[PDB]
Design brief:
Chain G: It is found in: Cytoplasm, Nucleoid. The structure is a homooctamer. By secondary structure, chain A is of the alpha+beta class. Chain A has a single domain, classed as Chemotaxis protein chec. In chain A, the strands form three sheets. A four-stranded antiparallel β-sheet of chain A has the order 1-7-8-4. Chain A has a two-stranded antiparallel ribbon with strand order 2-6. Chain A has a two-stranded antiparallel sheet with strand order 3-5. The longest helix of chain A is centred in the middle third of the chain and has 12 residues. Chains in contact: A-B, A-C, A-G, A-H, B-C, B-D, B-H, C-D, C-E, D-E, D-F, E-F, E-G, F-G, F-H, G-H. Chains F and G meet through helix 6 of F and helix 2 and helix 3 of G.
Chain lengths: 137, 137, 137, 137, 137, 141, 139, 137
């Protein structure tokens, strides 16, 4: 399981070092792809595989289903975690999430989310209460 | 099955001593995270695991689902219960729930909720009848 | 199966002697918690376990679901039935149901309900017909 | 299966003799409780067991469900069928259904219904057609 | 499977001779009960057992369900088919269906229906088309 | 597979004795006896007993406490019959049935996979004459 | 040889036979079932597959007027034909007329079955009929 | 698992060279067919098989289902991937997608999509946000 918030820094080669606590969870490689609200998601391949199936339960004959699948999977990537537990983030992905220097990794149980510290805080700053949001589920 | 109410105190080092009755239930570590109505939830890891699944059953393509999951899992933590049955409560969590000194532990079968004594009493003070509430389920 | 009505007395030490017919059903200990309409329910732990699950099928993201779970499980207790088949009723529970002296135990198949004789009679006094109530189910 | 109509008499000691055809069906004891329209139902414990479960499928958080369950099970009883195939009918039940002298036992497959002859005839005298009632199922 | 239409006679002792084609299907005894539209239904006990179950899927807490069950099972009877394959129809049932002399047995796959010839012809004379009726299923 | 599928149209004749000769292709499918009963739009359906058995069950899924279900069941099963196919593969059609469908001389048997339908030639052509398009009817399913 | 795909232009000879495209011949064993399709086309299936297609119908009322018209219009016209050694199929006359078959056929694979079309009718079908996207959106 | 974006060229003989990463996934042959928004899909035959089944869950008695199936499968093609990992794209398909020189292969987990670079870039240029689209699923 993946939980918690971590504050790390994007190094000069666009890599991120997995927090050791987290590094355990991930084997030799991960699938990265772009998330919602400008964040980049990280997953073990096995989990990436199961996330995807949750999509195939979507029409596909529906225009939006295709836009969604296109925006997600054409940007997913497969990266290897190096011995030091670092992940080189793809160029395009570094841009999609406005990554720069100062990353926040948040555990999402299933996956990891990589954010730009300022964007993440803004996200948190806006966005309603845990109670307000939950009542609507 | 965690049941009952317990009055306890947050010590100087922000630790809480599990009620012995309750300490049995909890093995070496637990997951903590913030709950609803400002309370902090405690769970055996495997129970936290099952709680999460109950979420994945939520859209995810929905904005609210994401806000909910981010609000919850970003603040979950994994704490070790020490030999004496004490748990050091993370600072951020100490603030989320206005924890101070004088905590209330309530069993919730599934998990534990840690409350500020005043807040919890006010919560009970407000909030309708067991019957009024049940009729709406 | 727990069936029937039994008139008993709350002794000096706040204990209740299980009717022997009923004592059988219950092994070494029971869970007690407060019921609806001021009554205190009694169950075999295994049965309390099954009763709880029937709750987990409730939202949880819903405010009312939490109120309900909090009002119920924070007052559940786990009591041991002594050799003479007596159960010491927790103070808080003795107060919730206006227990005093002169109890009524009614079998509810699944559980047992402990009433204040007066309250129970009034409850029966009010409350519509078996047919009137069944027609609405 | 319990079928048919039987005219019998409530003896002086409030006992009823099972019609022999019927006595077969019932082993050593039965559960008795009050029925709808003032009648008293009789069942093999095993069957009473199954009947109850059909209730557990009812809210319980609903006020009516609790009234229904209290009205029914608080009056259920467990009686032993004597060697001569007689069942002593509890006093309270003798009153609920205006039992007196002259009973009617009607098989309901699942259970037996004990009626006051006059009340039953009046029930039949009123009540719509088999077709009219069926069309509404 | 019982099929066909058969013209038979009610003998002076209120007996009917099962059609030989039909008698085979029916072992030593049958359950009889009153049908819909004044007809009397006949079934092998096993089949009656399965027909009943289809009812237990009806509320029971509903007044009409009870009237239906009562009207049906209070008149069900269990009759032995004699060696010559005859069935002595109970008095009450002879009157319910206005049985006189001149019966009509119709196969209903599941059961057999005993009708008064005239009543049946009238039933057929009224009642809409096979298509009209089917369209509404 | 021809022993498992009744397909096709066959023009045949109702002989003097009210018998129909099963087309040989079809006769294979049916064993020694069949169930006959009246169909919809005046046609008479034919089935292998075990198939008739499965058809019926599909009915038990209907209320029964419902008046229309009973009328349906009565109109169908009171007129079902069980007929033995003779050695020459002929089936004697019950009188009542012969009348229900206006059978006379000049029958049409159409394969309906599950069962066979016997029609009066004129009636069948008229049925076909009316009735909408394959497309129009399917759009409504 | 597992799924039928593609478009094929072929000819209906004077004896009313069509030659299965070889690619498609594999897929079909000794015989096929033919029947009339929608939009005037004639469908072809291995019998096992025809069997499976029918079941999908039994999931339809039957007590419903339309269900009967549909079944009558389809199965009364199905036919069981043998694919000769050269891989040809002799199309039943009645079917030849239902689809306005003449000379110049189009076979399109439909995974499950094959559809035999009149070249002109098929082109027109295609000329009309909306976009892949427009149609999909409505599923 | 097909992921990513790849820029490639349609050679003179209308062939495309599978990116090596991708060539692994695909065995000896693929099925091609035309996709939505003018793109051509590619799949291992087994996957093509599974994608089709997802269609059979559509009416068939519905005019649109037939159009959709006709438009798709009448243009599917089965192509062999040569030793050098090249696929000869059917002329008709080359025209459907306005393929020319300069293709973009995007992974779609399930299949591959072949696009004309300009068309693909325009598609992306228009088309709403990842979030906006997801919200509607």
């Amino acid at each position: 399981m993946l939980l918690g918030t971590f504050n790390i820094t994007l190094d000069a080669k666009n890599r991120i070092s997995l927090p050791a606590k987290l590094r355990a969870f991930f084997e030799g490689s991960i699938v990265i792809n772009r998330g919602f609200e400008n964040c980049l998601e990280v997953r073990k391949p096995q989990d990436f595989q199961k996330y995807f199936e949750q999509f195939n339960s979507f029409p596909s004959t529906q225009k939006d289903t295709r836009t969604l699948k296109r925006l997600i999977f054409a940007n997913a990537n497969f990266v290897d975690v190096d011995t030091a537990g670092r992940v080189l983030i793809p160029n395009n992905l570094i841009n999609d999430a406005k990554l720069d220097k100062e990353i926040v990794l948040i555990g999402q149980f299933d996956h990891l989310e990589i954010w730009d510290k300022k964007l993440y805080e803004d996200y948190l700053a806006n966005s309603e209460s845990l109670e307000t949001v939950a009542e609507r589920m």
